[PDB]
Amino acid sequence: GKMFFVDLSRCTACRGCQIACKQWKNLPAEETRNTGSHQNPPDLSYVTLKTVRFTEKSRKGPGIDWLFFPEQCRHCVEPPCKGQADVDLEGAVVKDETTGAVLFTELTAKVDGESVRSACPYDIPRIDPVTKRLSKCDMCNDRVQNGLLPACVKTCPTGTMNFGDEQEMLALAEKRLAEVKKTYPGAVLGDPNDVRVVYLFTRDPKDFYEHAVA
Amino acid sequence: ELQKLQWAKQTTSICCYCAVGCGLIVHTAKDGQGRAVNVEGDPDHPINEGSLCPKGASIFQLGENDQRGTQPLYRAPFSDTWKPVTWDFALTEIAKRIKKTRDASFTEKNAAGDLVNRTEAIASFGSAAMDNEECWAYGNILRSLGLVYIEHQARIXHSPTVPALAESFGRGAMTNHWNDLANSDCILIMGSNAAENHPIAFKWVLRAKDKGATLIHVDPRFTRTSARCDVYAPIRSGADIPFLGGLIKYILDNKLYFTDYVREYTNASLIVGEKFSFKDGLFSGYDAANKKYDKSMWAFELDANGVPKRDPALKHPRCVINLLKKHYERYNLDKVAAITGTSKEQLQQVYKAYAATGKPDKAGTIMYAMGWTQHSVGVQNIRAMAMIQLLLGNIGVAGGGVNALRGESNVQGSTDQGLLAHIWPGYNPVPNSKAATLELYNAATPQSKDPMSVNWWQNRPKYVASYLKALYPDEEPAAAYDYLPRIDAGRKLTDYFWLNIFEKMDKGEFKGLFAWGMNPACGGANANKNRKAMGKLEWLVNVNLFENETSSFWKGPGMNPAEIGTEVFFLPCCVSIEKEGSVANSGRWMQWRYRGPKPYAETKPDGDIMLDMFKKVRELYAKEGGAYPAPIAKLNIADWEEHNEFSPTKVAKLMNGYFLKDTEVGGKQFKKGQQVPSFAFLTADGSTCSGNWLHAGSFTDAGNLMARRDKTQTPEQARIGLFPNWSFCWPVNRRILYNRASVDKTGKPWNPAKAVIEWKDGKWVGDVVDGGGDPGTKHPFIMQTHGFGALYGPGREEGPFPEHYEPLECPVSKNPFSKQLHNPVAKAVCDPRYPFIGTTYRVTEHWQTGLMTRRCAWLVEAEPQIFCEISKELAKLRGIGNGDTVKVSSLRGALEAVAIVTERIRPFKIEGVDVHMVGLPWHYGWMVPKNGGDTANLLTPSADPNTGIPETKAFMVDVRKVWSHP
Ligand SMILES: Nc1nc2c(c(=O)[nH]1)N[C@H]1C(S)=C(S)[C@@H](COP(=O)(O)OP(=O)(O)OC[C@H]3O[C@@H](n4cnc5c(=O)[nH]c(N)nc54)[C@H](O)[C@@H]3O)O[C@H]1N2
Ligand SMILES: Nc1nc2c(c(=O)[nH]1)N[C@H]1C(S)=C(S)[C@@H](COP(=O)(O)OP(=O)(O)OC[C@H]3O[C@@H](n4cnc5c(=O)[nH]c(N)nc54)[C@H](O)[C@@H]3O)O[C@H]1N2
Ligand code: SF4
Ligand code: SF4
Ligand code: SF4
Ligand code: SF4
Ligand SMILES: [S]
Ligand SMILES: [W+6]
């Protein structure tokens, strides 16, 4: 199986990942306005599988602690969205055994949308108000199977985004966590046993976003 | 196979936004015959390794975009509607608008009987956004029509950067390159928001840290850059010279400078003449009446040969180094902390970290781009950076340099092609009216009697001659010399520049404007005045990608199309992925890109627009006579075209240069038709042409070196990432400038673990050596007259040492360093109704005026609207809540923006008082999108004599809450 290591100690919130996701899948842009934040779109939606969340936290001494959270489906080893869907219909939510990708099919139109979202501990799944299909990040599974990095991983300039076999990605996450802790002592990996998208947070994950960890 | 990319042709390209020069891969439907289907990073490019920021990552959406121009639009005097029109019309009509205006305004002789052969009725802005070949052609086209008022983007960074770095090192260019940042031990980001404005740079900034580098950001605001640096030090706007002067004092007082580097490679040892002094904030030779210096009071004492005298002991009290120590003694920690706002402890923290790079085994780099370097003393700010780097031996070494980051994809190249009023291509000056012959012109080049001083500019005549033999290859250079226009020796040079072009336009002193790849209606400071001024034009030619605030100013806010008589041609060009050519990045890497899709609809490359526009003028002159037919009819444009179209390949071969006849040079034979292999084999006698001596070596007999995609590296090359076989850089593939300063007098590197060059077995090994000669036989700054890195720089208008003169007018009354408050060589009203320091800056997602990015729905998605960033304290004082609509106003105008209240902005303590800074992006304009807002340049003032540059980083404003219904 595959896995992302996401080193948020290196993120410049350049939002190349946010545009790269939409370009590779030709997704439309949402209607947005500024409501006193750089953050936009303000949330995940049917046509937004990834948005970078911005949170400012006070620190003593000059400047702030600016926390950046490029949010996506965690591609859980044991995904509860699959369990809630399999109630109403099997094949609506499937699991790629080669890559580990959790994949929403067109049969998500059949199942109960709200309940499938409520069961996600990361509040990731999003429903089209018209066609009632569910959408989210799909690990760029097509690109992965043809030997390519997912769009958001290839586009990331800082070394925040990393992708490969769960073995060497876990190994790297541990090796990097140890190194980042020197600068950010409260640095932790997000549910590193349960997910295929392993975030290194520089502090309390909840500070980044309420659903950053389950 | 991935379906999306199956049956699509793959080509390479280079990003059309910032000067990092990131690689693209483009997929074009129908094996090349269709539209682009995908654009993303080139995994093999050594700079971005497949990475793109949101601007680069969204190029697909810029290109395949149905808001783009389709064909020419004509707007008639007093009309209120565009008129779709053909190309053959538009150009024919433009060719006539040129000739009429030229004929009526041409002056063969100025008001002193000096030959000038110029038109002053036509002006041209642009462009950093065109290909190098289109830039070179465009400058030559404008000058053959006899224009002198030729400016573009470059002006704003050129005026501060190039003189400061040329005075210091002998060239104006970024000294190192992007990959080389990873070799640095301490990175000072000061006057740069590089994580937002050069984002792939942080790939290499963060790799520096991985290998133990300390990252320092010195910035009035806390930005996306700040969040990823080890140290963030706030500085009060305009307190940079005090901050840098404290570092020079600290380095000198603690003997932290690298003595052997300073003794041999800087002018530390040169003896200044006794006429030099500095008292109460003034250098000797001050003319209090005219507010100007007699710079002859600053001259070195010379020996019996005219060579500057030297004490290699550094004991003579008139040694540059002892005068430097005396000058910076005043810049003690307590006064620097007081004026900057920086804590004494942070100042010690930063000074200690950066000054440690003085050790030969450590390298420090300084990154700045625009910041606030545009004011009167901006040149002195950059001079101070150069002086700190020369003291610490950081010039010429891997992970050192002054990395003066360029803005636009080809601003380096557009400058190299002389699209500024004062230069031809290759930084050969535009003649003044007193330069009556070619012989007098060459006379201006200073000479050196020092045998160790290469003084390479003594080769100028070979380059000026080969440039004239490229434009007029049947004519004698001395004859050819007469075709090209000249400026008034009497007049202040800045009268030909950006800022005066706007004042002149407003006084109706121009008939015709070329807005070629620029948006003046948004990019110009004081936009109300500038939109009004454009009315007073007879005609306007706008070449761009989209209809915009410039093309359509006649229907802007508050405008009456009926009342406005200006005649407007909008000519639509093709995007970067629809044409072939080169762009020159900030590191001087000249990179070739290819056509993916054919031009959209009936859009044209800039190359074809200008060539076809000119050939109409050429025609129309050949069958109606007038003005002065010589320049127009004789200009060699055959070498520019192939199969009936602009040829990027042939213009690039001309720019490189070829032998116009069999010739023997430097003890080698070359044949007629053959390509010049380097500028070392150019001649003054007419045996060679070359459109640009810097380009000589880029397109040889061995082929197009700009098009090389070869990662082959030796161990010493790969260790500091020179990548000498990826594309080509001027001059002659020297990747790090001044690299002779990286070694001692035997040619051993100071820091062998990161050698740039090394003397190994009668060869220099590594980078191409910057100056030929055995170790210890040449001074290392070969473009300098005397051959040294100048700590003392006597050519600068404000003095040979940087000195703090307050660039903030309104809130500051005290200078703690002298009795001279403002710049002694330099009118702001400071109306109390506007008590806040307004500033404008960029965000990652938008480009310039936003003409390109406000048309890309993914970038508008992320940053849809103009905003106003304010402190919590100033939100409290004005009862503004986060997300509230606010009115920002100045003497020059007003606009509405969404408030962003944040601790990222803090009050400046200036003279016991809290002074508030108010921040706006200048990325917005009325055309698009709906509810985006207008340009922040509504609020900015038009200006002063020094600079020829606007002020956009400090201007007095008010901000008021705009009220909703409960
Ligand atoms: N995303 C994006 N990138 C761009 C551009 C763009 O429009 N968008 N434009 C390009 C162009 S044309 C250029 S020239 C470059 C310029 O790039 P930068 O110079 O980085 O651009 P700015 O954001 O205008 O200014 C940089 C920083 O200067 C700080 N600053 C303001 N006043 C002072 C001062 O007195 N001292 C110091 N030390 N800092 C100060 C600001 O707070 C800001 O953080 O960017 C280029 N890159
Ligand atoms: N208040 C304020 N004002 C500023 C600044 C600021 O920081 N604050 N920044 C200043 C600076 S540093 C600069 S460099 C100037 C820039 O000011 P402008 O140059 O007027 O800015 P834009 O026109 O937005 O950007 C470059 C243009 O290139 C065009 N272009 C792209 N590709 C092509 C092509 O192939 N051909 C042609 N012909 N055009 C093409 C784009 O469509 C765009 O119009 O603005 C200055 N103005
Ligand atoms: S592309 Fe990389 S650095 Fe930029 S926002 Fe995404 S994860 Fe952060
Ligand atoms: S993160 Fe949520 S949507 Fe994605 S696999 Fe896990 S439970 Fe399903
Ligand atoms: S892995 Fe693919 S689908 Fe998922 S966020 Fe990244 S680019 Fe988008
Ligand atoms: S805007 Fe600059 S950093 Fe971003 S992709 Fe283009 S060249 Fe690279
Ligand atoms: S620029
Ligand atoms: W610029």
Side-chain angles (χ1 to χ4, degrees):
Chain A
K2 295 296 193 207
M3 163 179 279
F4 305 77
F5 173 53
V6 181
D7 182 359
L8 301 180
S9 74
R10 298 176 87 91
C11 187
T12 55
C14 76
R15 280 198 281 192
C17 43
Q18 172 172 320
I19 277 65
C21 185
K22 294 211 166 192
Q23 196 278 165
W24 172 247
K25 289 203 216 312
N26 292 103
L27 295 163
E30 299 186 23
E31 276 159 17
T32 61
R33 57 192 196 81
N34 204 308
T35 66
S37 203
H38 287 294
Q39 184 168 319
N40 256 322
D43 188 16
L44 295 180
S45 82
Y46 181 66
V47 301
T48 308
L49 320 178
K50 172 167 276 185
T51 194
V52 174
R53 298 188 180 263
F54 300 68
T55 309
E56 313 177 14
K57 216 197 170 283
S58 258
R59 76 192 196 193
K60 277 165 176 180
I64 60 158
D65 280 328
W66 213 355
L67 315 182
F68 312 129
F69 189 52
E71 188 178 21
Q72 60 179 125
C73 169
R74 305 306 198 281
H75 291 264
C76 300
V77 179
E78 301 290 297
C81 67
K82 196 182 187 305
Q84 185 62 72
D86 282 344
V87 173
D88 303 350
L89 186 61
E90 259 193 47
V93 177
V94 293
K95 203 155 61 170
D96 199 275
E97 50 174 21
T98 302
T99 56
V102 184
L103 300 167
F104 293 175
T105 79
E106 295 77 347
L107 304 156
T108 51
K110 295 289 195 279
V111 308
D112 189 301
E114 322 299 343
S115 63
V116 167
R117 167 165 190 176
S118 294
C120 181
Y122 304 96
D123 199 34
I124 278 299
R126 287 296 180 291
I127 190 176
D128 191 22
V130 172
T131 210
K132 289 288 184 308
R133 275 179 182 173
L134 293 177
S135 83
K136 54 171 194 68
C137 153
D138 67 4
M139 185 178 283
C140 279
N141 191 35
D142 264 292
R143 282 182 70 99
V144 172
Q145 290 289 18
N146 279 294
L148 292 193
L149 290 167
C152 55
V153 176
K154 177 192 174 167
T155 210
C156 179
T158 56
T160 291
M161 297 312 277
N162 304 266
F163 196 79
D165 303 319
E166 56 182 295
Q167 172 77 358
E168 70 196 349
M169 281 300 104
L170 278 164
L172 176 80
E174 297 318 308
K175 172 191 158 86
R176 190 68 60 68
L177 173 63
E179 194 61 17
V180 165
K181 270 180 165 178
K182 295 180 184 175
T183 311
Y184 303 91
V188 292
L189 301 175
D191 308 342
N193 294 318
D194 299 349
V195 298
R196 289 180 183 284
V197 184
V198 176
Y199 294 97
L200 193 172
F201 304 97
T202 49
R203 61 187 299 115
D204 181 341
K206 304 286 190 158
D207 281 330
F208 284 72
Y209 181 55
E210 64 159 312
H211 293 110
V213 296
Chain B
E1 291 279 72
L2 295 162
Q3 177 73 52
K4 198 190 178 189
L5 303 200
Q6 199 192 337
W7 306 314
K9 192 184 179 178
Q10 181 166 307
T11 53
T12 63
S13 188
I14 301 286
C15 189
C16 62
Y17 292 110
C18 98
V20 172
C22 293
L24 312 174
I25 53 166
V26 176
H27 291 265
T28 325
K30 306 184 174 180
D31 209 339
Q33 308 305 299
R35 307 309 311 155
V37 296
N38 204 70
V39 179
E40 60 181 69
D42 177 357
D44 296 309
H45 199 290
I47 297 182
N48 57 313
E49 308 168 349
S51 287
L52 298 170
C53 87
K55 297 183 303 299
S58 57
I59 286 177
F60 168 85
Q61 186 174 58
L62 173 81
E64 303 302 332
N65 189 314
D66 58 354
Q67 291 162 98
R68 274 177 71 186
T70 65
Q71 46 156 6
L73 305 181
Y74 170 72
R75 181 263 188 184
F78 312 101
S79 164
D80 78 313
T81 305
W82 283 111
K83 184 194 168 206
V85 60
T86 172
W87 275 101
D88 195 294
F89 178 82
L91 295 187
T92 289
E93 277 303 310
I94 276 162
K96 284 172 184 175
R97 293 313 182 289
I98 289 169
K99 175 162 190 314
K100 160 142 139 275
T101 314
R102 184 162 178 276
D103 291 337
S105 77
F106 205 84
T107 76
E108 290 191 353
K109 263 66 179 296
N110 63 355
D114 290 304
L115 190 67
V116 283
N117 285 344
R118 87 193 163 198
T119 323
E120 294 209 356
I122 311 176
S124 175
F125 276 125
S127 185
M130 284 189 285
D131 293 355
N132 247 353
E133 298 81 26
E134 298 172 341
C135 281
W136 185 77
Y138 189 51
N140 293 336
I141 279 173
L142 290 181
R143 283 192 170 107
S144 82
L145 298 181
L147 278 74
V148 298
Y149 286 97
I150 305 166
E151 288 280 284
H152 79 287
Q153 291 101 316
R155 172 57 58 203
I156 301 185
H158 185 283
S159 282
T161 297
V162 162
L165 292 195
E167 182 84 41
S168 304
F169 306 148
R171 310 183 177 102
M174 195 193 169
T175 69
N176 294 37
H177 62 93
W178 300 111
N179 284 70
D180 189 55
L181 287 180
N183 305 310
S184 195
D185 295 299
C186 198
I187 304 184
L188 181 56
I189 314 190
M190 187 164 176
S192 156
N193 193 24
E196 294 197 53
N197 297 327
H198 298 87
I200 268 55
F202 251 72
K203 172 177 285 279
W204 305 102
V205 173
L206 285 185
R207 274 176 201 174
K209 173 166 167 164
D210 298 345
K211 295 179 292 191
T214 305
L215 319 184
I216 307 166
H217 197 214
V218 181
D219 203 298
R221 318 177 299 113
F222 194 91
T223 75
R224 308 194 210 177
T225 301
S226 312
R228 294 285 80 86
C229 293
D230 296 295
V231 185
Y232 167 73
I235 192 173
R236 180 271 277 181
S237 314
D240 297 46
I241 295 196
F243 179 103
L244 294 176
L247 186 45
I248 293 173
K249 191 192 181 283
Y250 177 104
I251 291 157
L252 289 176
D253 283 355
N254 292 298
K255 298 290 157 56
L256 287 174
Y257 61 90
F258 178 14
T259 298
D260 273 354
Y261 182 109
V262 174
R263 183 187 286 107
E264 307 298 333
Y265 295 169
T266 82
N267 67 3
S269 87
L270 265 72
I271 301 300
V272 183
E274 281 187 325
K275 280 180 200 315
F276 177 79
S277 69
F278 176 78
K279 195 70 177 306
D280 303 334
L282 301 180
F283 292 99
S284 71
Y286 186 50
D287 179 356
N290 293 251
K291 294 180 75 212
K292 187 157 64 62
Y293 285 110
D294 177 25
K295 304 211 282 281
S296 66
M297 297 280 281
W298 304 343
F300 297 114
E301 210 191 325
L302 316 176
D303 70 20
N305 301 118
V307 174
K309 285 182 204 204
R310 296 164 55 196
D311 165 24
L314 308 179
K315 302 290 149 172
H316 200 300
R318 272 161 40 238
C319 274
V320 168
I321 184 82
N322 289 323
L323 296 175
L324 179 77
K325 289 185 168 143
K326 186 187 86 214
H327 187 93
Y328 288 100
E329 77 182 355
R330 289 169 295 112
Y331 291 83
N332 71 63
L333 287 174
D334 296 310
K335 282 174 178 164
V336 170
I339 191 179
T340 55
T342 314
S343 75
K344 181 173 203 201
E345 301 98 280
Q346 271 212 303
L347 283 177
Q348 289 166 302
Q349 167 173 35
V350 172
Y351 288 1
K352 178 169 170 72
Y354 197 81
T357 68
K359 308 332 191 276
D361 77 312
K362 297 297 182 169
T365 189
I366 302 176
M367 300 171 65
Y368 84 85
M370 201 206 177
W372 193 23
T373 63
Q374 292 67 248
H375 57 74
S376 327
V377 303
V379 170
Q380 291 293 342
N381 194 353
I382 296 159
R383 281 273 299 123
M385 291 175 172
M387 297 159 69
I388 288 165
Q389 287 299 70
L390 283 174
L391 283 179
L392 301 175
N394 279 332
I395 299 300
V397 300
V402 177
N403 289 311
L405 313 187
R406 268 61 190 152
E408 289 228 33
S409 70
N410 196 34
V411 69
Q412 186 58 57
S414 63
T415 311
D416 300 343
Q417 296 340 308
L419 298 191
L420 295 178
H422 72 284
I423 41 167
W424 291 346
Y427 300 89
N428 296 320
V430 167
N432 71 29
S433 46
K434 300 295 175 217
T437 65
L438 183 53
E439 191 184 21
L440 264 176
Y441 177 91
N442 285 288
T445 303
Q447 297 291 331
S448 173
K449 304 301 303 313
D450 194 325
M452 294 186 67
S453 170
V454 179
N455 185 34
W456 191 259
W457 272 127
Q458 76 183 293
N459 287 290
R460 175 160 278 126
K462 304 173 188 182
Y463 309 153
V464 176
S466 305
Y467 169 61
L468 292 175
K469 285 308 286 185
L471 299 202
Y472 305 108
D474 298 322
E475 300 286 13
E476 296 286 3
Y481 179 75
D482 276 317
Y483 300 142
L484 287 164
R486 312 194 177 148
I487 49 159
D488 274 353
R491 223 186 306 184
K492 191 148 158 44
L493 206 68
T494 50
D495 289 342
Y496 292 106
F497 290 7
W498 176 297
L499 195 80
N500 196 43
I501 291 171
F502 280 107
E503 187 172 327
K504 284 181 62 60
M505 198 187 314
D506 176 50
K507 302 180 304 188
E509 287 184 335
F510 287 115
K511 286 179 179 288
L513 182 57
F514 292 106
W516 205 294
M518 291 197 59
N519 191 25
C522 280
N526 197 2
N528 284 324
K529 175 160 142 56
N530 293 334
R531 288 163 185 185
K532 275 205 180 70
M534 271 179 275
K536 303 181 181 170
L537 291 159
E538 273 173 25
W539 55 271
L540 167 55
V541 179
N542 192 214
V543 194
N544 219 321
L545 300 172
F546 305 87
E547 193 198 333
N548 58 103
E549 293 90 353
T550 296
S551 61
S552 313
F553 78 88
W554 46 261
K555 63 180 161 180
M559 298 280 142
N560 276 20
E563 290 246 316
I564 289 158
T566 304
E567 189 175 17
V568 189
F569 300 72
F570 172 86
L571 311 180
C573 57
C574 70
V575 291
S576 53
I577 65 173
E578 289 167 3
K579 64 188 167 174
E580 204 191 2
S582 66
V583 288
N585 84 340
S586 189
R588 298 166 277 98
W589 290 30
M590 295 150 69
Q591 318 195 73
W592 201 267
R593 56 192 189 189
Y594 303 93
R595 210 154 319 252
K598 63 161 58 61
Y600 176 57
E602 297 315 313
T603 69
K604 295 170 166 295
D606 293 281
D608 292 292
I609 304 190
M610 66 186 47
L611 183 52
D612 294 357
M613 186 187 71
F614 170 76
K615 280 169 73 140
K616 287 285 178 196
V617 170
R618 178 130 128 164
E619 252 206 301
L620 178 54
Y621 264 71
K623 274 159 285 185
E624 283 189 6
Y628 178 49
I632 300 168
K634 304 198 181 191
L635 181 57
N636 147 39
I637 52 168
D639 273 303
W640 299 13
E641 95 164 54
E642 204 176 90
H643 302 108
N644 278 288
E645 298 174 348
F646 187 92
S647 173
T649 329
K650 282 184 71 234
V651 176
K653 281 179 85 179
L654 186 60
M655 287 164 77
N656 176 94
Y658 58 91
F659 288 100
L660 299 186
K661 81 196 208 204
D662 303 75
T663 312
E664 177 157 25
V665 193
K668 298 185 167 202
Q669 265 85 13
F670 302 98
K671 309 193 69 59
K672 186 159 146 81
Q674 200 182 327
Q675 290 286 123
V676 177
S678 65
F679 51 68
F681 305 90
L682 287 170
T683 65
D685 66 2
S687 274
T688 67
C689 69
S690 166
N692 193 323
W693 77 270
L694 293 188
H695 282 235
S698 76
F699 207 146
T700 69
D701 278 358
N704 183 347
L705 302 200
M706 299 179 277
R708 283 186 299 191
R709 291 175 51 85
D710 175 10
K711 290 187 146 169
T712 303
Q713 275 193 111
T714 69
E716 42 268 4
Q717 287 169 1
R719 201 185 302 122
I720 66 175
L722 292 173
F723 289 100
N725 305 303
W726 196 282
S727 83
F728 171 91
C729 66
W730 74 255
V732 287
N733 217 47
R734 298 158 180 165
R735 297 279 153 145
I736 296 167
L737 298 180
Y738 323 119
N739 56 31
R740 288 189 67 95
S742 66
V743 294
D744 68 22
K745 294 165 102 192
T746 69
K748 270 204 183 55
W750 301 123
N751 186 20
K754 292 176 175 168
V756 177
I757 64 173
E758 185 177 17
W759 193 244
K760 268 187 297 186
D761 206 347
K763 277 186 167 79
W764 289 113
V765 154
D767 195 10
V768 173
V769 65
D770 185 23
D774 290 324
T777 67
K778 312 290 154 163
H779 307 316
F781 296 88
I782 71 181
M783 305 304 289
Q784 296 280 65
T785 304
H786 310 303
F788 307 103
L791 299 159
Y792 179 89
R796 289 298 94 237
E797 301 303 344
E798 313 79 8
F801 294 136
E803 176 62 20
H804 172 55
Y805 307 114
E806 189 47 66
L808 279 187
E809 314 202 38
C810 303
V812 185
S813 60
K814 284 171 174 168
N815 175 356
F817 299 111
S818 90
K819 317 193 169 159
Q820 190 67 49
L821 175 59
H822 294 305
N823 183 351
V825 306
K827 214 54 134 53
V829 166
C830 298
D831 192 309
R833 289 176 298 156
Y834 311 103
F836 308 134
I837 304 179
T839 198
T840 65
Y841 47 69
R842 299 134 172 75
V843 307
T844 311
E845 301 82 5
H846 279 296
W847 184 247
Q848 309 286 65
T849 65
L851 189 159
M852 292 179 79
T853 58
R854 290 190 269 104
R855 299 287 187 176
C856 300
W858 300 318
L859 304 182
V860 169
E861 188 174 30
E863 294 281 354
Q865 305 192 283
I866 191 160
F867 58 80
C868 186
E869 297 185 301
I870 72 188
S871 71
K872 292 198 160 201
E873 292 89 333
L874 171 56
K876 204 176 181 287
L877 167 72
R878 277 282 195 281
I880 302 166
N882 197 55
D884 286 343
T885 305
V886 291
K887 183 190 166 77
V888 185
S889 53
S890 68
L891 293 163
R892 288 79 46 182
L895 58 78
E896 293 204 300
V898 184
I900 299 173
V901 173
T902 173
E903 295 170 30
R904 289 187 290 101
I905 298 168
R906 281 288 172 179
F908 312 140
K909 279 91 168 78
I910 302 186
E911 288 167 19
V913 192
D914 270 14
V915 186
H916 308 293
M917 172 200 55
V918 174
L920 305 106
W922 65 285
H923 299 307
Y924 295 94
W926 58 265
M927 188 70 92
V928 65
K930 190 159 145 51
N931 298 130
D934 211 343
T935 178
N937 276 320
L938 289 181
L939 299 168
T940 63
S942 309
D944 65 9
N946 268 155
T947 43
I949 321 164
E951 178 54 63
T952 62
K953 275 296 195 311
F955 56 90
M956 305 314 292
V957 297
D958 198 22
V959 57
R960 292 285 159 172
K961 176 149 167 195
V962 165
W963 263 112
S964 324
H965 185 267

